[PDB]
Design a protein around this ligand. Structure first.
Ligand SMILES: *C(=C)C1=C(C)[C@@H](Cc2[nH]c(/C=C3N=C(/C=C4\NC(=O)[C@H](C)[C@H]4CC)C(C)=C\3CCC(=O)O)c(CCC(=O)O)c2C)NC1=O
Ligand SMILES: *[C@@H](C)[C@H]1/C(=C/C2=NC(=C\c3[nH]c(C[C@H]4NC(=O)C(C=C)=C4C)c(C)c3CCC(=O)O)/C(CCC(=O)O)=C2C)NC(=O)[C@@H]1C
Ligand SMILES: *[C@@H](C)[C@H]1/C(=C/C2=NC(=C\c3[nH]c(C[C@H]4NC(=O)C(C=C)=C4C)c(C)c3CCC(=O)O)/C(CCC(=O)O)=C2C)NC(=O)[C@@H]1C
Ligand SMILES: *[C@@H](C)[C@H]1/C(=C/C2=NC(=C\c3[nH]c(C[C@H]4NC(=O)C(C=C)=C4C)c(C)c3CCC(=O)O)/C(CCC(=O)O)=C2C)NC(=O)[C@@H]1C
Ligand SMILES: *[C@@H](C)[C@H]1/C(=C/C2=NC(=C\c3[nH]c(C[C@H]4NC(=O)C(C=C)=C4C)c(C)c3CCC(=O)O)/C(CCC(=O)O)=C2C)NC(=O)[C@@H]1C
Ligand SMILES: *[C@H](C)[C@H]1/C(=C/C2=NC(=C\c3[nH]c(C[C@H]4NC(=O)C(C=C)=C4C)c(C)c3CCC(=O)O)/C(CCC(=O)O)=C2C)NC(=O)[C@@H]1C
Ligand SMILES: *[C@H](C)[C@H]1/C(=C/C2=NC(=C\c3[nH]c(C[C@H]4NC(=O)C(C=C)=C4C)c(C)c3CCC(=O)O)/C(CCC(=O)O)=C2C)NC(=O)[C@@H]1C
Ligand SMILES: *[C@H](C)[C@H]1/C(=C/C2=NC(=C\c3[nH]c(C[C@H]4NC(=O)C(C=C)=C4C)c(C)c3CCC(=O)O)/C(CCC(=O)O)=C2C)NC(=O)[C@@H]1C
Ligand SMILES: *[C@H](C)[C@H]1/C(=C/C2=NC(=C\c3[nH]c(C[C@H]4NC(=O)C(C=C)=C4C)c(C)c3CCC(=O)O)/C(CCC(=O)O)=C2C)NC(=O)[C@@H]1C
Ligand SMILES: *[C@H](C)[C@H]1/C(=C/C2=NC(=C\c3[nH]c(C[C@H]4NC(=O)C(C=C)=C4C)c(C)c3CCC(=O)O)/C(CCC(=O)O)=C2C)NC(=O)[C@@H]1C
Ligand SMILES: *[C@H](C)[C@H]1/C(=C/C2=NC(=C\c3[nH]c(C[C@H]4NC(=O)C(C=C)=C4C)c(C)c3CCC(=O)O)/C(CCC(=O)O)=C2C)NC(=O)[C@@H]1C
Ligand SMILES: C=CC1=C(C)[C@@H](Cc2[nH]c(/C=C3N=C(/C=C4\NC(=O)[C@H](C)[C@H]4CC)C(C)=C\3CCC(=O)O)c(CCC(=O)O)c2C)NC1=O
Ligand SMILES: C=CC1=C(C)[C@@H](Cc2[nH]c(/C=C3N=C(/C=C4\NC(=O)[C@H](C)[C@H]4CC)C(C)=C\3CCC(=O)O)c(CCC(=O)O)c2C)NC1=O
Ligand SMILES: C=CC1=C(C)[C@@H](Cc2[nH]c(/C=C3N=C(/C=C4\NC(=O)[C@H](C)[C@H]4CC)C(C)=C\3CCC(=O)O)c(CCC(=O)O)c2C)NC1=O
Lengths: 164, 177, 40, 172, 324, 164, 177, 177
């Protein structure tokens, strides 16, 4: 849970110190950023069912070969286990917009993902294609403000740089 | 580890639900009353070593058995560590107030404290009194009920954290018991 | 006599310092080699 | 040693590429500032004894333990070796001003100057104060308008201060 | 940045900056289930210290899966992880099987203990365990004696300590630390005194000869010298390095005497000009003007300033000047 | 040099990762404090000779036995070394106000203080008798703004707990 | 280690001076131009994993002997390390842009990289080409002048922040040479 | 490492000899004056704390640049290290006085001290004034010549030990200069 609070209280504890003034004003910045980080989270929370749909079938448009036998898309349950696999990644981003930092991604999503995808024969190139779809057609005056979108996209390209 | 922000993201995770406008007001008032949390840790840490020595030498003026011959606080070596056992637990409940959740010390400060004090014969009768008077030093600093110290603070209310930090002080008194 | 010396084994209990160590590491050094016969 | 023209060539030769049209424009900008580059090293080398001795005198005026008996400038020979070192550095900064880069300053003055002053016992904090005093004695002297036509020299004067700050930080 | 007087500190400008920042202290007995984002930092910090900034590829790391699992269970850092990791194949490949025996002892002192073997008896105390009990008890002797337990905790990663006064070794072993640990962006394979194939402190570690300290990043960080004895009993050759004594009438005439070390000596850049000579480029025996770079000198005080100009105006650069 | 920037680039180099928004929201609070924290260091620098003189004259006046022979305040050059010893501490608190955190204090004056006053017989009880005068003599409507005096008085209490 | 505010302290400590109205003005523009510097490091941490592989391929496409048997990047493990060696260099330049001054890559990366690369045998011309690619990649990312990706910023200037990060890349080539 | 007794047995080991008449006479004289050797060592370690405070304050009052900003003893961390760099020096000289042989400070203190001080930046021309002051203090204690402390002793002469301890204190200044 690598947020702004749990990185200063771990730095003082490693030295054996009390929370000094350099700790108390790095959490002032947590206050002046929540207004551009929390309204981008509820907007995802009230519209995640319609945005994970058009982002889900983007990889099923580009990598349309996936529905061959021996691959990730044979039967309908492999699709239902695919629109679930992408529904989680919008939730783990939604947790990273209410904890402040990049905590819930790199312990639950990112951690242990390179080895579950190598042995289950899941191509990671369709993960980075479905994620970069919803990263690339949000427009800043309609769905968010100019300050929420830079916050929202920064946790999106954290995924693509971790997978690829 | 798990602060007040990370507390709601595992309660919502274990039911597999998005965090939304039903429960984003409890973190809206948390942010909007965050300056009261900064005006409470800064009013503790300014005399954090002072409220140890008033309490660890204030524990013994109710109980002269600690500097009895054969007592637990007899020598200078045992008195160095008692003032050292008394500055860690104050430091770790400073960590639980900047975070907003107790989970920083039930894995680091209190994980197995009960078995070390019964190993060394550190008695459970005095350490509860050693933190109860330090808790009263803690709750008397965030509000301006201290005697010779009156820090110039902005007006308002601080009875919210005063029922909170003392709730982080009787959990160690229930863990070492 | 066996060798040049007869130093004790590191598998014997109560061999480390345990003076001003952490509470994580104090409990590790008092129960060093006593766990077997407690469960026997 | 290299100058500012032999620096661009040695860069381009390692990549083996033909100098661009927008890289001859940088060198033809560098020749248009050519008279003023001579107007600074003429104003400095015609004042070199007044630059050193007015700044050496100001050094021992506020650090009297250097010339107190027992210090690291009390002898006539330990003092004559001190004004020599303040003139060594000014000579290799004026060498590094017509060249346009600090290549003759490093390879012939500064590489080894810190290792020398640790061995001999010379206090490196006071060689900085000696060097920094000659910098603004020369910066204010290079802004003298007398004899030169009035224009702007603020990108060359800032470059001469950069060679002094490099030689000061390479001895501490 | 270099120097010793700028920030009123001197050890963080010898390459020990990043080592002076970390603790990696593992504040709980077992790893908490549900999470891995805190103990993965403890795992990888143990890897960069015990292997010494070595690269371990993800297939090389996946050989050591079992161990990393017991330490994340209820087991400890020194005996269940650092002792298990030094008995794997990814450790024995780089630090044991590539080297002679004394290369292995010098790297187990650096990796496990964080210091230097000073004197022949620290080598011999660890050499004799291998001859009677093999490798798997030779690693135990670095752990289960009376040095590890009093310095590092049960759950702290073994940080570097061979430079500080608490490690009561010597002052010659202070200079030997800055031959092993040459900065933070360096590894054991990646320093020019041991290329994972030899013994880094062979003659100087046995005889406790102090070395000149050359700071990493200084102009002259490439200084390296080869070894030959002199004297007819050991059947050695004269003319390779300089002496370390300055013994005779040339000691105190021309002032006191210093030992200077030069490194960069190329064939252009000798004469009193700016450009290389053109023509034949070599004499008839076609060796060089300087048949090897890294020359060292012994010079008095009254000849130090003419020598300094001969060094730098002919291309060389000064790595260290120590007084003799 | 513990500041807000040096906290996070050393927390990140510990893990070996890139600066995320758990490192960028910290430096936002560095902007939300420098408008008032740098205001106190502007006042202290142009006033320090009127403050260091009032600070020592509230120490010797209470600790009048230090001017007896045999003590650490014998003659005029020792007392002239007593204003030099305090005008460092008013300079080190000036250096902490511009780096944001408590960087210069805990490694230039504090680090090693227990051995340089116990050896040279310097009483550590008189140092706190002068700094607490300067803290208790701090009047936020006239002399400062109300938010400088929150944090200017917070570094003197870092000295007092580290000297006691 | 030393940020921009940590550099005016050590410069004023050698004078033993107080920082004042002539030196605070240089740092008062540093907090006014802080929302651009936070806006610009975000643009390079986002496109970080693509800048590396574009530069190791770009070095290889100009020097095809580097994958030949006997070249430095021949096998997989030698190639995998070059993608590692090239991104620790980028990770400290993202640090030195975040602080303000060049003393985090100087004393943790370039203090010891000259003799790192003359012990492994890494060519010091191929590596400074891969640095000079990422120098141009970051300058064309800081200004919105990249070809295939554009990021939405508030309109203004970052020419000063562009030439600052070029100076950080330019001393890597001067160090390891 | 080696005492006066083991110095003899390694000289007669080279001859494959025993110990006889002429080689035990200088060794029985060590045992004869052995009560005075203990009686001199105790006079140093009884008041070594004032001997290291007065010594490094005599170097400072002679060289006022050591506490300048940029002086080697400027901050408290560098000054406290000086206060124990000379306390380690005094500990090893009192070992060589006790054992009667200079082979213990030669091994564990002097060997490599010159190369250590030039690395850290310690001025070695000012470290020798601190030892030469301690040489004058140590010979003014094993002879009752200290101006402000007189110690009771049995009657007799101890000028041979005054030249023994002055040979140790001069080789510390010969190993670092
Ligand atoms: C002996 C029997 C005995 C003492 C010794 C002394 C210690 C003590 N003090 C309290 C209550 C408080 N202590 C406080 C601490 C401080 N007050 C200050 O102003 C300074 C900053 C600081 C000391 C460094 C505070 C604020 C309180 C609460 C208000 C009050 O004055 O009571 C106790 C607790 C008593 C109890 O409930 O058991 C003790 C032991 N008091 C003694 O009686
Ligand atoms: C209870 C502990 C107190 C009390 C607290 C209140 N404080 C209020 C506001 C406040 N406090 C600070 C300083 C704080 N902010 C920081 O960023 C840092 C350090 C980095 C600290 C210590 C500020 C800046 C503010 C905002 C108002 C101002 O600028 O003056 C406050 C009002 C806000 C609210 O209620 O939400 C309260 C009630 N007040 C009390 O009466 C007791 C004693
Ligand atoms: C030059 C590199 C760019 C450019 C930069 C500008 N950015 C400006 C404003 C800006 N950016 C952010 C986001 C940033 N700040 C944060 O605190 C965090 C996360 C913690 C991030 C990612 C913010 C908040 C702002 C300020 C917006 C506002 O207050 O309106 C900006 C305008 C400010 C100024 O001009 O001083 C500029 C110029 N813009 C460009 O066009 C080039 C390409
Ligand atoms: C501590 C007070 C000891 C003690 C030590 C002795 N010091 C002796 C000589 C001596 N003391 C100083 C330092 C003094 N002179 C100064 O100029 C300054 C500061 C500016 C100071 C603090 C020096 C320099 C010397 C020796 C001169 C030299 O050789 O360079 C000494 C010898 C006899 C004597 O002078 O009293 C002793 C015994 N005296 C004590 O009684 C306590 C235990
Ligand atoms: C020159 C260094 C001194 C001095 C030395 C003399 N000491 C003499 C006798 C002596 N000292 C002690 C105490 C000493 N012996 C111990 O066993 C221990 C600690 C365990 C200590 C400190 C004793 C017991 C004796 C023996 C006789 C006695 O005093 O009862 C001595 C005369 C006897 C001899 O030479 O063997 C001398 C000359 N005296 C001086 O005047 C200077 C200061
Ligand atoms: C902005 C770049 C364009 C724009 C594109 C359009 N999007 C349209 C529908 C649509 N957009 C989204 C993404 C958006 N809705 C969300 O709920 C969230 C996150 C919580 C985001 C980023 C979705 C999911 C949908 C489909 C369902 C819906 O409308 O909510 C749209 C109309 C139909 C279409 O063309 O797809 C357009 C034109 N819209 C704009 O106004 C600017 C030009
Ligand atoms: C003082 C108000 C108490 C009291 C204190 C004593 N504690 C003693 C030893 C001791 N305490 C701990 C726990 C402490 N160490 C930690 O690492 C942490 C958390 C991170 C805590 C809270 C440990 C582990 C030990 C073992 C010895 C040691 O580590 O120093 C102690 C005895 C010291 C000794 O035996 O030498 C005392 C007196 N005891 C009291 O009677 C009052 C109530
Ligand atoms: C800059 C620090 C001065 C300054 C300099 C200017 N000098 C200008 C022209 C100029 N300078 C020289 C002397 C130079 N040329 C040589 O050949 C030699 C040695 C033999 C020297 C010292 C000459 C001959 C000229 C005439 C060429 C010309 O007209 O450019 C100059 C240009 C004039 C102008 O811009 O109006 C400038 C600016 N002027 C300053 O104000 C500062 C103090
Ligand atoms: C998968 C089909 C299973 C299952 C597997 C899990 N195992 C988990 C943790 C874990 N497992 C072991 C035993 C392993 N380590 C060994 O050394 C050996 C044999 C020599 C074995 C078999 C250990 C020690 C642990 C501790 C955790 C750790 O090592 O980090 C585990 C949870 C991982 C976690 O909590 O993060 C799982 C899911 N569990 C299942 O439900 C199915 C049946
Ligand atoms: C790629 C752009 C280069 C290239 C890179 C190679 N680097 C190799 C090994 C290596 N590199 C470093 C330095 C790196 N580690 C750090 O901690 C930092 C900065 C803080 C940096 C820059 C180290 C320490 C090592 C040693 C790894 C080890 O010994 O395990 C390397 C060889 C890898 C191997 O031999 O297994 C290569 C090929 N080489 C190239 O040709 C291009 C120019
Ligand atoms: C004080 C009179 C001197 C002076 C002393 C300093 N020593 C500094 C560091 C240091 N010194 C030693 C040598 C010491 N330690 C030993 O273990 C032994 C022999 C057994 C000796 C003689 C070492 C090893 C070190 C490294 C630091 C450490 O070990 O912790 C030092 C600098 C401290 C710093 O760098 O911050 C000083 C100032 N220097 C002086 O100016 C006077 C002459
Ligand atoms: C809480 C976090 C969380 C995640 C991130 C995912 C991650 C994840 N996905 C799958 C499992 C899967 N994930 C996918 C999804 C896809 N396959 C592809 O190649 C496409 C990229 C994508 C479709 C869009 C599919 C098809 C499976 C089934 C694979 C199989 O069972 O053979 C599994 C194995 C268990 C299972 O079969 O369900 C796990 C752990 N699940 C989680 O619980
Ligand atoms: C400090 C005190 C101290 C001790 C007393 C011993 C105690 C001791 N003995 C053994 C171990 C043993 N001890 C004995 C001894 C005996 N068995 C018999 O049949 C006889 C009754 C008796 C001796 C006559 C035997 C036979 C072993 C078995 C070794 C093995 O299992 O291979 C071990 C485990 C092996 C080891 O750790 O090295 C230990 C700790 N070690 C110590 O450090
Ligand atoms: C840059 C960081 C820095 C500091 C924090 C101080 C700390 C400090 N003060 C003194 C030294 C001193 N400090 C004092 C001051 C006092 N003594 C007292 O007894 C009173 C309590 C108090 C008056 C206010 C005096 C009188 C001395 C000289 C003591 C002596 O050696 O005679 C010394 C020894 C060096 C010296 O003699 O100057 C040092 C390191 N100095 C520094 O350079």
């Amino acid at each position: 849970m690598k947020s702004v609070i749990t990185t200063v209280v771990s730095a003082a504890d490693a030295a054996g110190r009390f929370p000094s003034n350099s700790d108390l004003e790095s959490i002032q910045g947590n206050i002046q950023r929540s207004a551009a980080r929390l309204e981008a989270a509820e907007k995802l929370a009230g519209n995640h069912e319609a945005v994970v749909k058009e982002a889900g079938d983007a990889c099923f448009a580009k990598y349309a070969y996936l529905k061959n036998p021996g691959e990730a898309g044979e039967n309908q349950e492999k699709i239902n286990k695919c629109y679930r696999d992408v529904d989680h990644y919008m939730r783990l981003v939604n947790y990273c917009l209410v904890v402040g930092g990049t905590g819930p991604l790199d312990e639950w999503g990112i951690a242990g993902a390179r080895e579950v995808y190598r042995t289950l024969n899941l191509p990671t190139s369709a993960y980075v294609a479905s994620i970069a779809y919803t990263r690339d057609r949000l427009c800043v005056p309609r769905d968010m403000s100019a300050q929420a979108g830079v916050e929202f996209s920064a946790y999106l390209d954290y995924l693509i740089n971790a997978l690829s | 580890m798990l602060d007040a922000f990370s507390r709601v993201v595992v309660n919502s995770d274990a039911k597999a639900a998005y965090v939304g406008g039903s429960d984003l007001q409890a973190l809206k008032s948390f942010i909007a009353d965050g300056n009261k949390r900064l005006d409470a840790v800064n009013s503790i840490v300014s005399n954090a070593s002072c409220m140890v020595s008033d309490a660890v030498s204030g524990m013994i003026c109710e109980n002269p058995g600690l500097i009895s011959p054969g007592g637990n606080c007899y020598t200078n070596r045992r008195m160095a560590a008692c003032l050292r056992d008394g500055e860690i637990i104050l430091r770790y409940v400073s960590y639980a107030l900047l975070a907003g959740d107790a989970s920083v010390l039930e894995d680091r400060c209190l994980n197995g404290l009960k078995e070390t004090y019964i190993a060394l014969g550190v008695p459970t009768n005095s350490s509860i009194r050693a933190v109860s008077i330090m808790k009263a030093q803690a709750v008397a600093f965030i509000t301006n009920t201290a005697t010779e110290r009156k820090m110039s603070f902005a007006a308002g209310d601080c009875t919210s954290l005063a029922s909170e930090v003392a709730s982080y002080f009787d959990r160690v008194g229930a863990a070492i018991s | 006599l066996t060798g040049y010396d007869s130093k004790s084994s590191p598998n014997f209990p109560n061999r480390a310092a345990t003076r001003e160590r952490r509470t994580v590491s104090f409990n590790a050094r008092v129960a060093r080699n006593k766990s077997q016969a407690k469960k026997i | 040693m290299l100058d500012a023209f032999a620096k661009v060539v040695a860069q381009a030769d390692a990549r083996g590429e033909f100098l661009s049209n927008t890289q001859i424009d940088a060198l033809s900008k560098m020749v248009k500032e050519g008279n003023q580059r001579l107007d600074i090293v003429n104003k400095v080398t015609s004042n070199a004894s007044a630059i050193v001795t007015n700044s050496a005198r100001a050094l021992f005026a506020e650090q009297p333990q250097l010339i107190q008996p027992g210090g690291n400038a009390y002898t006539s020979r330990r003092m004559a070796a001190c004004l020599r070192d303040m003139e060594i550095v000014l000579r290799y900064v004026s060498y590094a001003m017509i060249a346009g880069d600090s290549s003759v300053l490093d390879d012939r003055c500064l590489n080894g100057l810190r290792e020398t002053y640790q061995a001999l016992g010379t206090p490196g904090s006071s060689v900085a104060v000696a060097i920094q005093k000659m910098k603004d004695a020369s910066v204010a002297l290079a802004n003298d308008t007398t004899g030169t036509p009035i224009g702007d020299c603020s990108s060359l004067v800032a470059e001469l201060a950069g060679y002094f700050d490099r030689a000061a930080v390479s001895v501490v | 940045r270099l120097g010793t007087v700028s920030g009123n500190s001197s050890l963080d400008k010898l390459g020990l900056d990043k080592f002076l920042s970390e603790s990696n202290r593992a504040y709980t007995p077992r790893a908490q289930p549900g999470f891995s984002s805190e103990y993965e930092q403890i795992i990888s910090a143990t890897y960069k210290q015990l292997f010494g900034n070595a690269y371990i590829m993800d297939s090389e790391r996946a050989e050591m899966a079992k161990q990393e699992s017991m330490f994340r269970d209820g087991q400890l850092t020194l005996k269940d992880f650092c002792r298990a990791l030094a008995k794997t194949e990814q450790y024995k490949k780089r630090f044991f099987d590539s080297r002679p025996l004394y290369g292995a002892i010098e790297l187990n002192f650096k990796n496990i203990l964080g210091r230097t073997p000073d004197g022949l008896e620290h080598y011999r105390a660890k050499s004799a365990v291998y001859d009677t009990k093999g490798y798997e008890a030779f690693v135990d002797a670095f752990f289960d004696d009376g040095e590890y337990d009093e310095v590092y905790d049960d759950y702290t990663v073994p940080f570097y300590r061979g430079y500080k006064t608490e490690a009561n070794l010597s002052m010659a072993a202070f200079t030997h630390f800055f031959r092993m640990v040459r900065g933070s962006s360096t590894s054991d394979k990646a320093n020019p005194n041991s290329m994972q194939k030899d013994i880094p402190l062979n003659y100087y570690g046995i005889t406790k000869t102090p070395l000149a300290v050359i700071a990493p990043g200084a102009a002259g960080t490439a200084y390296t010298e080869s070894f030959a004895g002199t004297g007819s009993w050991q059947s050695g050759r004269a003319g390779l390095n300089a002496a370390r004594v300055a013994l005779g009438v040339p000691a105190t005439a021309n002032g006191k005497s210093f030992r200077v070390e030069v490194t960069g000596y190329t064939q252009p850049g000798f004469g009193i000009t700016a450009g290389t000579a053109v023509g034949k480029l070599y004499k008839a025996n076609k060796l060089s003007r300087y048949p090897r770079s890294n020359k060292s000198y012994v010079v008095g005080f009254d000849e130090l300033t003419p020598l300094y100009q001969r060094i730098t105006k002919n291309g060389g650069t000064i790595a260290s000047i120590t007084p003799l």
